[PDB]
Amino acid sequence: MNLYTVIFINILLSLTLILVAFWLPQMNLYSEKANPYECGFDPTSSARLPFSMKFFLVAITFLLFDLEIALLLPLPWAIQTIKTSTMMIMAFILVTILSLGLAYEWTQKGLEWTE
Amino acid sequence: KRPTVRPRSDVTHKQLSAFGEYVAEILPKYVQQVQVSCLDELEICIHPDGVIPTLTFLRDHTNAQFKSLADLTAVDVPTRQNRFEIVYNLLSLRFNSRIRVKTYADELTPIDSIVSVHIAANWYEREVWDMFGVFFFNHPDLRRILTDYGFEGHPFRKDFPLTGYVELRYDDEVKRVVAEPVELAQEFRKFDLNSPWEAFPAYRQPP
Amino acid sequence: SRAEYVVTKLDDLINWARRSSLWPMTFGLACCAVEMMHMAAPRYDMDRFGVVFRASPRQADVMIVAGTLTNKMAPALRKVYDQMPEPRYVVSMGSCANGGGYYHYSYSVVRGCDRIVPVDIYVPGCPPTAEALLYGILQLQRKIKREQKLKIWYRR
Amino acid sequence: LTLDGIKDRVLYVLKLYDKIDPEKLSVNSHFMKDLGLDSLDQVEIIMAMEDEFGFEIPDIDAEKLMCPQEIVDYIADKK
Amino acid sequence: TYKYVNKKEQESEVDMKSATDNAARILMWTELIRGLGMTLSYLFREPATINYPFEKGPLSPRFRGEHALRRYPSGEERCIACKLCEAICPAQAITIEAEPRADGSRRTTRYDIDMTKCIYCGFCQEACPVDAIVEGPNFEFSTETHEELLYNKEKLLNNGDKWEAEIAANIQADYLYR
Amino acid sequence: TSVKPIFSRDLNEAKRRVRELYRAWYREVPNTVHLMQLDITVKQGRDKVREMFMKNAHVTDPRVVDLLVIKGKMELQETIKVWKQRTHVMRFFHETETPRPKDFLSKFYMGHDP
Ligand SMILES: CCCCCCCCCCCCCCCCCC(=O)OC[C@H](COP(=O)(O)OCCN)OC(=O)CCCCCCCCCCCCCCCCC
Ligand code: SF4
Ligand code: SF4
Numbered sequence: 001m002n003l004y005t006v007i008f009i010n011i012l013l014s015l016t017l018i019l020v021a022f023w024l025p026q027m028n029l030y031s032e033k034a035n036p037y038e039c040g041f042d043p044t045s046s047a048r049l050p051f052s053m054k055f056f057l058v059a060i061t062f063l064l065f066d067l068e069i070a071l072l073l074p075l076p077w078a079i080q081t082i083k084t085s086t087m088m089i090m091a092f093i094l095v096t097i098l099s100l101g102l103a104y105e106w107t108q109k110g111l112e113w114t115e
Numbered sequence: 116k117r118p119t120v121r122p123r124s125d126v127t128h129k130q131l132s133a134f135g136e137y138v139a140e141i142l143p144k145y146v147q148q149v150q151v152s153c154l155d156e157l158e159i160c161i162h163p164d165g166v167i168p169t170l171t172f173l174r175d176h177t178n179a180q181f182k183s184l185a186d187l188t189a190v191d192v193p194t195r196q197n198r199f200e201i202v203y204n205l206l207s208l209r210f211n212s213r214i215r216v217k218t219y220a221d222e223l224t225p226i227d228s229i230v231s232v233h234i235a236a237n238w239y240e241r242e243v244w245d246m247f248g249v250f251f252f253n254h255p256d257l258r259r260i261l262t263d264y265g266f267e268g269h270p271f272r273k274d275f276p277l278t279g280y281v282e283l284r285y286d287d288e289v290k291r292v293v294a295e296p297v298e299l300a301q302e303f304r305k306f307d308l309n310s311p312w313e314a315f316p317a318y319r320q321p322p
Numbered sequence: 323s324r325a326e327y328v329v330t331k332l333d334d335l336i337n338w339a340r341r342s343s344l345w346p347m348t349f350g351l352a353c354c355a356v357e358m359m360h361m362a363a364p365r366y367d368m369d370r371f372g373v374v375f376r377a378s379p380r381q382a383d384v385m386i387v388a389g390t391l392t393n394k395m396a397p398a399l400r401k402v403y404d405q406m407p408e409p410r411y412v413v414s415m416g417s418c419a420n421g422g423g424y425y426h427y428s429y430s431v432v433r434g435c436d437r438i439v440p441v442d443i444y445v446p447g448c449p450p451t452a453e454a455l456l457y458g459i460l461q462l463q464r465k466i467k468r469e470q471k472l473k474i475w476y477r478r
Numbered sequence: 479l480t481l482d483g484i485k486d487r488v489l490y491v492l493k494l495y496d497k498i499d500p501e502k503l504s505v506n507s508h509f510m511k512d513l514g515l516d517s518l519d520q521v522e523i524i525m526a527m528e529d530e531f532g533f534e535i536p537d538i539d540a541e542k543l544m545c546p547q548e549i550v551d552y553i554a555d556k557k
Numbered sequence: 558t559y560k561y562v563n564k565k566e567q568e569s570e571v572d573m574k575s576a577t578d579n580a581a582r583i584l585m586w587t588e589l590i591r592g593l594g595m596t597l598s599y600l601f602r603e604p605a606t607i608n609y610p611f612e613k614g615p616l617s618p619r620f621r622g623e624h625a626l627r628r629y630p631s632g633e634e635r636c637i638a639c640k641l642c643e644a645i646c647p648a649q650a651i652t653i654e655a656e657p658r659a660d661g662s663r664r665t666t667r668y669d670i671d672m673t674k675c676i677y678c679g680f681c682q683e684a685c686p687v688d689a690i691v692e693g694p695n696f697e698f699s700t701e702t703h704e705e706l707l708y709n710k711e712k713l714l715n716n717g718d719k720w721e722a723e724i725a726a727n728i729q730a731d732y733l734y735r
Numbered sequence: 736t737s738v739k740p741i742f743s744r745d746l747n748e749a750k751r752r753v754r755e756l757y758r759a760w761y762r763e764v765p766n767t768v769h770l771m772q773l774d775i776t777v778k779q780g781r782d783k784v785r786e787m788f789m790k791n792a793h794v795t796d797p798r799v800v801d802l803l804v805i806k807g808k809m810e811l812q813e814t815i816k817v818w819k820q821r822t823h824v825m826r827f828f829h830e831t832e833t834p835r836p837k838d839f840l841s842k843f844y845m846g847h848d849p
């Protein structure tokens with residue numbers, strides 16, 4: 001209950017700050033002020049267009065590596081087991097296969113960005 | 116020997132004159148009025164049909180390796196019918212020598228570009244167009260370079276007023292920067308400074 | 323416990339904040355930007371006064387027009403100023419910005435930034451000694467010391 | 479192809495130009511003499527046609543397209 | 558003559574010691590620790606920051622700041638409306654209108670300087686043949702209004718009557734170098 | 736009477752170029768009133784295009800026409816691309832320039848100008 005309490009207290013602190021930031025000061029709104037900023041001149045287009053990504057393969061790979069991390073995290077418990085040889089072998093196999101996949105990606109130039 | 120005057124060597128004069136004879140007799144179809152100055156500088160005047168051939172020869176030829184385009188200018192002389200005197204100053208690193216090539220143009224008489232020869236001339240020719248109104252041919256992107264985006268006129272023309280024809284300000288009514296005809300609080304003061312006594316009799320113009 | 327006295331003290335506080343924290347904008351056009359830098363340098367430490375160059379107009383409080391303002395650049399200057407949030411002050415640095423200066427009679431110069439934006443303080447020089455630009459910053463600090471906004475609201 | 483609906487769309491675009499007076503408008507009226515037009519207000523009409531039927535057409539032709547009937551025939555020949 | 562900056566590299570000879578040294582450099586971040594050490598050294602140095610506006614930056618007599626019209630020790634004005642100052646002022650900031658003063662002397666009625674046009678070049682005080690117009694040392698003359706920066710004869714005369722004790726000494730110091 | 740031609744060996748080819756340019760401008764106006772957020776209609780823009788075109792209708796030398804078309808294409812480039820802002824576009828309309836009258840008598844009442 002205490003965690004809920006603290007987190008809600010923080011929500012309320014932030015929201016109070018934002019309220020008194022949006023309602024305390026004097027405002028003077030007009031279009032030339034509320035318009036987007038592109039270094040003094042007018043945008044040539046919208047920022048809602050495809051912004052190509054050159055590390056898409058690395059992001060995809062990051063997904064699988066995050067999963068491998070999820071599978072590595074139970075080790076603190078897996079080391080309390082009687083079958084220690086099995087845990088050792090499985091952890092070594094997992095990390096080695098992970099490293100081999102990374103090495104194949106590296107060599108085939110996946111970690112390098114499309115230009 | 117005299118400490119105020121400037122030491123003068125004729126060796127460079129001779130070198131540049133010989134090379135001028137070289138250029139004149141190797142490009143007769145284009146060359147006009149080669150000349151060398153008291154200060155050691157070579158000036159080769161040509162017909163504009165010869166721009167690209169002349170510059171390519173001076174860049175690629177072995178005894179002439181002027182392959183750095185220092186500058187590219189124009190000069191308005193409203194007197195002559197072909198006002199604009201286009202100038203090509205060049206440099207040879209192999210011979211540590213310079214040279215200047217000149218042509219002539221008009222408001223309605225364009226010449227050819229040399230970006231095929233010297234890529235340095237893209238912006239210089241854009242500048243000539245923006246400032247004097249000379250149009251170049253086969254230019255990749257010939258637009259304005261220095262003037263405003265909607266500027267009318269070619270300001271370096273002697274006929275263009277120093278202060279222009281318009282003037283900018285901000286108007287709250289429209290909430291924009293607008294252009295209004297010029298109106299000055301202090302008018303530029305024209306000083307007549309030329310002395311009425313001949314100063315250099317070596318340049319006297321006979322009547 | 324007069325409300326007028328309380329309001330005067332509150333306004334003193336408001337101005338103290340907006341004054342001891344003046345974040346200008348990285349907006350330098352010509353030579354005078356060099357003296358701006360030099361005023362950011364050790365000998366004259368800006369941050370010592372609370373001054374900090376923020377590059378976004380949406381975060382800045384003042385803009386120093388540090389050099390010549392051409393007709394091709396005036397729209398961008400007015401746009402940036404417009405994009406700065408009130409309270410916003412302006413400082414004209416040099417003779418180019420005040421009245422065009424050495425290029426007053428040119429076809430591509432606005433004879434004063436005060437035509438495009440409203441100016442609070444004028445710093446003369448070509449270029450103004452960084453010491454002079456600092457003198458101007460402090461002159462601005464005092465001008466802010468004398469805003470008296472809430473007193474006006476209470477008198478309305 | 480269809481010289482009947484083509485002509486309907488064409489006279490429609492003409493009426494929609496809104497620079498001419500329908501009194502002297504027909505299927506063979508002359509843009510310049512009959513309706514009192516010039517080069518650019520004919521360019522505009524031919525471009526309105528380009529829009530209507532979508533098929534982009536040269537100027538070498540849009541210049542000779544000087545009456546609604548010529549438009550009809552050009553639309554028919556190309557489409 | 559010439560020298561190479563990044564061609565020093567010669568043919569490759571490698572030992573175990575060299576390999577291990579480069580490895581330690583690459584693994585322990587040797588070269589970055591040195592920048593850290595430099596920044597540390599600077600923390601324990603005396604800052605060059607002066608305490609403005611109490612202690613101020615140095616200057617020299619030749620400093621050319623605010624303009625002022627001087628006088629002879631008798632109180633008479635030094636200007637004679639010769640107009641070299643406005644004839645050379647490359648910003649066309651000076652404006653002069655002369656007229657015979659009642660006593661017959663050649664003096665000015667108008668002497669205006671748009672200090673928004675002055676580039677503070679000093680040509681006017683080296684052109685003045687009577688050391689009348691000078692560019693004083695004052696640089697702390699900022700304003701809240703553009704109009705205040707358009708000086709006339711009275712303003713410059715008052716400045717001269719305000720800084721003479723300093724202008725005269727700086728002149729006395731610098732006038733042999735000219 | 737004999738000179739070098741820039742592009743057009745006669746006024747008809749120059750007119751072809753002028754018409755191409757008119758089409759380009761007529762097609763572009765809407766995209767730039769949309770993009771630049773101009774506060775005018777699409778008809779005002781095309782009327783202004785036509786007026787700026789007629790401003791030089793009197794020319795008869797094909798070289799002047801070719802150079803005018805070059806300048807117009809330069810401007811159309813500056814506009815298709817947004818290199819120029821709504822400021823430079825509305826400069827064409829002169830929304831603030833007090834319109835000097837062509838009546839001799841008003842010109843007489845205000846100033847010595849003819
Ligand atoms: C029997 C033993 C069994 C146990 C096995 C372990 C044995 C010991 C192995 C020791 C290995 C050394 C420690 C590993 C960390 C260093 C990793 C590394 O070397 O990365 C180097 C990397 C590349 O550097 P680069 O010169 O560009 O070379 C590129 C390759 N050609 O560049 C870098 O990664 C570094 C650049 C980072 C720059 C960011 C700023 C760094 C700031 C430095 C602060 C230092 C303060 C440290 C404070 C720590 C306190 C918590
Ligand atoms: S006032 Fe002088 S120093 Fe400042 S930008 Fe202009 S020319 Fe440069
Ligand atoms: S210092 Fe130079 S620019 Fe300034 S008033 Fe004197 S001559 Fe003119």
Ligand code: SF4
Pocket residue numbers: 635636637638639640641642643653681684685686687688689690
């Ligand atoms: S140069 Fe000196 S004496 Fe001559 S007009 Fe100027 S201020 Fe007066």
